[PDB]
Design a protein around this ligand. Sequence first.
Ligand SMILES: NCCc1c[nH]c2ccc(O)cc12
Lengths: 236, 338, 57, 278, 128
Amino acid sequence: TEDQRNEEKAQREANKKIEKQLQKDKQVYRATHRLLLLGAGESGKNTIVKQMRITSGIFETKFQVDKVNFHMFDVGAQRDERRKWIQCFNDVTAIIFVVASSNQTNRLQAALKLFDSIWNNKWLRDTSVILFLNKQDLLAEKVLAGKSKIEDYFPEFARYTTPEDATPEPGEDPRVTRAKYFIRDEFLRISTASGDGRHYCYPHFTCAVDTENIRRVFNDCRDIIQRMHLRQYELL
Amino acid sequence: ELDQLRQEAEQLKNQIRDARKACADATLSQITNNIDPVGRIQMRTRRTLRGHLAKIYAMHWGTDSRLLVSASQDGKLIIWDSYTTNKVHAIPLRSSWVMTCAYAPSGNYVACGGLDNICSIYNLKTREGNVRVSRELAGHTGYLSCCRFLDDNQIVTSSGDTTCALWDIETGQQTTTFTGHTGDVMSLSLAPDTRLFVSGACDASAKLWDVREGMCRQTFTGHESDINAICFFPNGNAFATGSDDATCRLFDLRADQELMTYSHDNIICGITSVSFSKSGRLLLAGYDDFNCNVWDALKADRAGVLAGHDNRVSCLGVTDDGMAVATGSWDSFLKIWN
Amino acid sequence: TASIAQARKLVEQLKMEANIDRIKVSKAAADLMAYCEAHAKEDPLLTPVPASENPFR
Amino acid sequence: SGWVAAALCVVIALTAAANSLLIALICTQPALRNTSNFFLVSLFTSDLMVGLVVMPPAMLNALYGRWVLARGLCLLWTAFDVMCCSASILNLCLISLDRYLLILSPLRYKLRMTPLRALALVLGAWSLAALASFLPLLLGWHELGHARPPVPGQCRLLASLPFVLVASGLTFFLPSGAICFTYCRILLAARKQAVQVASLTTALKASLTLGILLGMFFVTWLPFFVANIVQAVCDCISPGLFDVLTWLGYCNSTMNPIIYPLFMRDFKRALGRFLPCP
Amino acid sequence: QVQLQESGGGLVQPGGSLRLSCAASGFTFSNYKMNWVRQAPGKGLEWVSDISQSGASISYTGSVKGRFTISRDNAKNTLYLQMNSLKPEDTAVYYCARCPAPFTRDCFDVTSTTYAYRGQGTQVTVSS
Ligand SMILES: NCCc1c[nH]c2ccc(O)cc12
């Protein structure tokens, strides 16, 4: 028994040390929020990533807001297919989806289809998605220039009317606001048709060079975690 | 001319179908009716391992049925003592996104990989008293989905870029590659003799490869969706696969055709992992509906259900001697059944 | 070039697949059982083992 | 009476069974082990201790009508009852504060609330209750209160204006105000968030939740304290009504542990997984 | 093996009509969602329309909404896409692709330039 006890005591000591290390790591693991960055091929994801920062298959970016740890991962050298490796990002705090508001094809329709697929995924039904409508300034120029794209490929835009809840900024004509809110409503229709209530969408109109994007993400994450807590306490 | 080659391919496929049909004078299900059913099987969780924080994605049993390696998306790799549940090592990984892990046959090396496209091998010698990365095998253009060890010096890895490769640990570069697949390769299994190994891809086709010759030998199809798991029959002359269509199929190398298929009308979720018993009579398959099932391979009758998990059963493994079955799930808990 | 090369490779693979030995399903099925009930005596999962030697309790 | 005796016996049995079941369910499952659940398990343990210690002597005295134990034991029992009620109220207030911190500051909750902080707060609340209960006994501040009527052989709680007012205030009113403020802020945030969600296009439930939670506690507790204040001015009242109010407070103590599990879906799912199978 | 074969289509002057039929085999056609995609010359793949398993829900792209129509018949494992009022931009190779998984409303990799679960397709051309 002495020989067996010699190994048993060593095993117990090793287990105690490993448990202490795991307990120490648990605090840091729980105190950091994981985020996923996604978007179209030629979207403005790179510009936003550099703004927040100021051959590998994945890139990670670390930033802090109000002493809150944030960890974000950007998909790197990965194949076009997404239905397999996307399932990994099912426990992230939120999914950041960036779509350009403008080889080029009907990108907006493809973005809508991708957003619908992400929303309807069984494993992603518990994860909220933060939506960024990028390249809004370019949309304004494209609308004011006379040449138009949405009115051509989107027929419902002709019958669309600006919602009364709209809060447009000063100095912009009705046309750009109408188009922006039409795209926003197109996204909200898909995001709200299910009506599950387990996850919600947070649309945003952001320019590529925008300083307050970090604040938008922080507010969205705070709202998501807080809403999860209210749901946990049976209120919502 | 593209039309000529694509018509010759159709002709060859029709000829192969005719040849396969000509050999099917009888079905395994009809012959197996003379076998005595195993009957209901009672299994209970004997040991529960805790310490993981994120969803567990993969695990591997040891060659002595004593130590096992568990990989979680937290970025921590832990080795557990099955009998005493005492952790022996805690390896902090460089990348949190893990997708597979492997245990060397001698137990002196451990390997893992994931979305980083890099396979990292850890040495348990611990001459300095700590475990450190022996070498990292980069080169894959897609996420590393599965990996297995032929020996202490040879490792087979798979990635989601349609390429399977064999790596030399000492030199650290690929020795041979397989390019027969068209979709992402999900899992691979090594034959008992290690001469042959199979791999499943997201195209409903299973390919048989020769490690020494480094080229495809046979191709198997019949699944209605992507293949998520694959495991060899203990004799090494057959293997079973799992797919999203919620039906398992058994393929025989000699017959070049599927002998039997396991399915249930009430089950609609796909299969995540599969494994055979020591004698191969019992087939254990995990399902997305928060439970696992045991199938009688010879009668295609469900002999029991394992429903001790709270979330998706990501991994499933059976000891070499069949003493107990260890299963893992996305709830960060391991259930050992006997 | 890529399309024609892929088609030629597929045709060659099919040709190789069409020139391999194949065994009857019946003998393979018989061998499966010959292995199954041959090794049925070392299956703790198939047949419960008493606690006298079971390491899990 | 036999009927009231049986009613009290079944009430205390239900209290003990529910408290034990809740404590066992919390302890056995590692999933429910959380910093927030520390306050809940402490409150459940406190309720179990109340049911084990204070309830049986009270029901025995009520049924017999005479104290069949030592007078010093009666004094200790009264002090223990005071400490028990103060600790229960403080634990409820701490639970409310923890919920406020989690809701109004989820991201900063981990930094502003650590297990050490929770343990320190719980220990401080328990020590404060013990002090508020025992200090007058140890230092004999009761003698200063001459408003106490002569004891007719049945020992009861002191009613001198200074001590009764100070204790009732510090132990019920300030915690009550804190709880009301916390739940008002919670309701305001919930309504804001509900209107925000409804702003998107292709309520009574939360209001009912908070209303029940506040109303049960208020309706059950306020009558006893107002009766005690009425006694402080030596007003005439039937002792039976005072005993009824005290037993209503004890029924509140019995009822409180089982309401919360129904209102936290983690506990609801744990109960669904554990209780039906037997 | 699962195989999808497209049929029909050809050269037609603008303003005409064409009938495209997709043949499904090797799988339960009724348990999978069906989609239509096209690839114009010099351009990448793009989604056109999709139909649910039971056909209750049908959607079309804005550029073709109101012009084309799709339908399915599980009794024959056939999928159809009726085209009318052709325009010079309609010239493209049309592929019949199947949603990767059954009993689900999500389809991810239909048009990611490498989808294995789609047919060879047919050439559609329009000229004066
Ligand atoms: N039974 C109520 C015990 C009690 C708790 N707090 C109190 C404050 C004052 C008092 O007289 C009595 C109490």
